[PDB]
């Protein structure tokens, strides 16, 4: 109809444009139109309806403390250890009512004319944790001594990511020179016929990007390789020295970058606070700041409901489930949100990951998230949306491991992160529930270079019940903490900006990223990791959010430890393309080794590392093809990763992920299809807008150059920062009930990623207009005071330009 409009975003404006492509009126400045200060941003946005617009608005000003020491044993007991900085917060405003510059959920009423009245704000508390005196699971341990990694940049390399290897796991357990008694006594450790006693326990924290506890701040800067240069975990060496190295190598815009990276204009775009550089040397505010600023990025409404995540270039430990009604709530943990794996197995394999736990150990220091009884405390989120009265959702697990806290310089694992390979062995039994619920790595590591005769293997040749000479023995794995050290081990929590657990230069980390390791079976099978590149996904009902909302309210009390539990969700492994990388390594050849160090990458979606995945665009769709009598309408929801589409499959007549009755056949639930090469020149981190059309089914992708840096790592000017690019994803394969004998799906119904043809170099896009099922209109700016717009043909998706009409809406 001529009387609909369409709503276009411009920085903190919502302009309503007719379908005759021009503006209605100036449209809605949100951040004015609600009261509130100019440092405010709007970062998401989404219309219910046709009487409501909610909007979600974050400022560079937010400023947030942890209140660690814990002083005396008794005080208030009940005051957060988390709070809003006001003092520092009126500190960064000089560079007029006191405030914390908290992030709001906006609610707006539909007016005449096209216009929105503003009706309510609810304040984005920050979550609770009770500061203790006690110095029964404690978080608040947890923060104390929690370190979080240096956000990844679209500029990382490869060599950055790549940490010097960890101790052998022979070496922890029989110590320096006595690891020649494992094959006798591995038995009586735990480690019964364990083949990997050279298996790499995890990374050295000495050197390389920064690892920050919640009030200390990340650098701008960041190294080549980090394997040569950076100080890993030490702040006080680079405070002291390190910083002055740093500063005088990688200086910012107004100095050869051979040891680090000035990454200051990438950070900015990824949601960082970088003072000096917000649209309205200094270090960058704390670590709890920068997760406080990220952690407010996106949003769903779900009747009355509001749920806020986080981004999906910086990891996020909370998230909010707010009241309409409410004027404030707190966020979520994601450390007490208890989510399905899949198995039980594939819980066990992260959880154990997650640091230290023993009965005869009770030290404080101890103070990893195992030890405490929590959960998976970070995620990469690709997106959340609604469908059927249904959130759902798609996110990358953020690496999360322990890390040795002992001040003994001559011990093992001294500086050093706990954290291995959890490939499935080289035996395992045929499937994917097999394959997933494989022993090798559970407890321990395993995987490391095994030379058969003259072809080797990043994987281990025995796992799960396959071991002693019988080949009917347990192969054992455990905890790399020695038995004589496990009632005085002091193991903290890490968390990595990045899917990967670890970090640890070898070539088992670049085959466990890239997805490398195979079987030597005719009927070759992907051998999975149950700890590095998941992606986790599902469906969650008002009654699973409604237990999240109940506790985050929750006040220390008597459920301080108790959990959410999310039980229709799913883990699946999704490594980033091996074809991404030049000099991809191959296992069963002829010795001719390729480490994370050594790794070329040759990938052109926007990131110059080849080994970390990245999920973007989580966007539900209702399928609008007719289903069989007496079942309900399709859903899927789809999102992009590197090198392809992933397309998530749900039962409607449940609201649960789609099922099927065999163990062995792969989850129909999960479907990945690689996207060609025009796609994958596509810069995955400028996504500006994601559209379901519900009448064709299909999903539109726009890339908007302009959400590029303004300057690389080495500080020059970023080549094509104008310009558009759109890709259209499409259902493929069988759909559930697509008939009246459709009962079980063996094959998981797929979707196709596209560039549709609206593409572009040249100009700075305004938005696309869906004009009708037949043409699309491309508004563009250069100068242009009504925009150009450009008419274009939809051919089921595919767009081809309309040369006659595209000047006729032009001239004049």
């Known amino acids: 109809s001529l009387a609909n409009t369409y709503l276009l975003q411009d920085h903190n404006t919502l302009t309503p444009y007719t379908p005759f492509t021009t503006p209605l009126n100036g449209g809605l400045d949100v951040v004015r139109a609600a009261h509130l200060h100019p440092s405010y941003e709007l970062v998401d946005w989404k219309r219910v309806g046709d009487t409501k617009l909610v ?104 060599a950055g990511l790549a940490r010097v290897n960890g101790v052998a796991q022979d070496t922890v357990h029989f110590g320096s020179g006595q690891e020649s008694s494992w094959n006798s006594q591995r038995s009586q450790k735990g480690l019964k016929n364990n083949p990997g006693p050279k298996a790499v326990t995890g990374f050295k924290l000495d050197k390389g990007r920064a690892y920050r506890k919640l009030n200390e701040s990340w650098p701008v800067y960041e190294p080549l390789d980090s394997t040569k240069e950076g100080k890993g975990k030490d702040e006080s060496s680079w405070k002291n020295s390190e910083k002055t190295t740093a500063e005088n190598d990688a200086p910012l815009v107004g100095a050869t970058f051979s040891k680090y990276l000035n990454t200051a204009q990438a950070l900015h775009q990824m949601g960082v606070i970088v003072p000096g550089l917000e649209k309205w040397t200094d270090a960058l505010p704390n670590v709890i700041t920068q997760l406080y600023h990220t952690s407010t990025a996106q949003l769903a409404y779900l009747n009355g409901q509001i749920v806020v995540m986080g981004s999906d270039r910086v990891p996020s430990l909370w998230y909010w489930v707010v009241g309409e009604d ?54 990469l989120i690709a997106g959340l949306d609604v469908v059927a009265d249904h959130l759902v959702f798609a996110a990358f697990k953020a690496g999360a491991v322990g890390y040795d806290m002992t001040t003994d310089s001559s011990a093992s694992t001294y500086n050093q992160a706990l954290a ?37 293997a990043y994987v281990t040749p025995v796992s799960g019940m396959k071991g002693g000479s019988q080949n009917n023995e347990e192969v054992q794995t455990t905890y790399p903490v020695k038995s004589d050290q496990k009632a005085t081990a002091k193991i903290a929590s890490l968390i990595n900006a990045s899917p990967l657990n670890s970090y640890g230069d070898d070539g088992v980390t670049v085959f466990d990223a890239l997805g490398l390791n195979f079987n030597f079976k005719l009927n070759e099978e992907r051998l999975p990791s149950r700890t590095d590149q998941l992606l986790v996904y599902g469906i969650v009902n008002e009654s699973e959010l409604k237990s999240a909302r109940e506790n985050a309210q929750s006040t220390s009390d008597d459920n301080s430890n108790t959990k959410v539990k999310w039980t229709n969700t799913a883990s699946h492994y999704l490594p980033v393309p091996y074809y991404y990388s030049a000099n991809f390594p191959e296992a069963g050849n002829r010795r001719r080794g390729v480490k994370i160090s050594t790794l070329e990458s040759q990938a052109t979606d926007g990131f110059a590392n080849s080994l970390l995945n990245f999920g973007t665009g989580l966007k539900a769709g209702v ?31 449940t609201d649960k992920l789609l099922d099927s009755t065999d163990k062995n056949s792969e989850p129909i639930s999960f479907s990945y299809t690689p996207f060609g090469s025009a796609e994958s020149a596509v810069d995955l981190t400028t996504l500006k807008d994601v559209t379901y059309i519900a009448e064709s089914g299909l999903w539109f992708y726009t890339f908007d150059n302009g959400e590029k840096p303004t300057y690389d790592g080495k500080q020059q000017q970023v080549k094509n920062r104008k310009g558009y690019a759109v890709i259209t994803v499409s259902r493929t394969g069988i759909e559930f009930n697509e008939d009246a004998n459709t009962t079980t799906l063996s094959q998981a119904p797929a979707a196709l990623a596209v560039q549709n043809g609206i593409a572009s170099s040249q100009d700075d896009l305004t938005g696309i207009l869906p004009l009708s099922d037949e043409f699309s209109a491309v508004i563009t700016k250069d100068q242009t005071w009504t925009g150009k717009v450009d008419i274009y043909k939809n051919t089921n998706g595919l767009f081809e330009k309309d040369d006659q009409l595209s000047e006729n809406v032009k001239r004049r």
Request: charged share 20%; net charge neutral; proline share 5%.
């Open 326 to 379: 409410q004027e404030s709530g707190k966020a979520t943990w994601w450390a007490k949100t208890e989510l399905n794996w899949g198995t039980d197995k594939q819980k066990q394999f992260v959880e154990n990951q997650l640091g230290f736990k023993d009965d005869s150990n009770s030290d404080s220091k101890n103070s990893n998230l195992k030890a405490q009884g929590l959960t998976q405390p970070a995620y």
């Open 55 to 158: 909007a979600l608005v974050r400022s560079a000003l937010v400023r947030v403390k942890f209140q660690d020491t814990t002083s005396s044993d008794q005080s208030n007991t009940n005051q957060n250890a988390l709070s809003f900085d006001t003092q520092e917060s009126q500190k960064a405003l000089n560079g007029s009512n006191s405030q914390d510059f908290a992030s709001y959920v906006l609610i707006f009423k539909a007016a005449p004319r096209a216009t929105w009245v503003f009706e309510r704000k609810i304040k984005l508390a920050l979550p609770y944790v009770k500061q203790e005196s006690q110095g029964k699971g404690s978080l608040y341990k947890t923060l104390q001594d929690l370190l979080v990694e240096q956000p990844v940049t679209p500029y990382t390399p490869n």
């Open 420 to 456: 291995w390979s959890t490939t499935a062995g080289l035996d395992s039994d045929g499937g994917y529930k097999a394959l997933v619920e494989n022993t090798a790595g559970l407890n321990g590591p395993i995987n490391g270079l095994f030379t058969l005769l003259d072809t080797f």
């Open 623 to 653: 399928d609008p093809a007719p289903v069989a009598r007496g079942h309900k309408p399709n859903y899927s929801a789809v999102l992009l990763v590197r090198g392809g589409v992933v397309r998530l499959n749900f039962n409607p007549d």
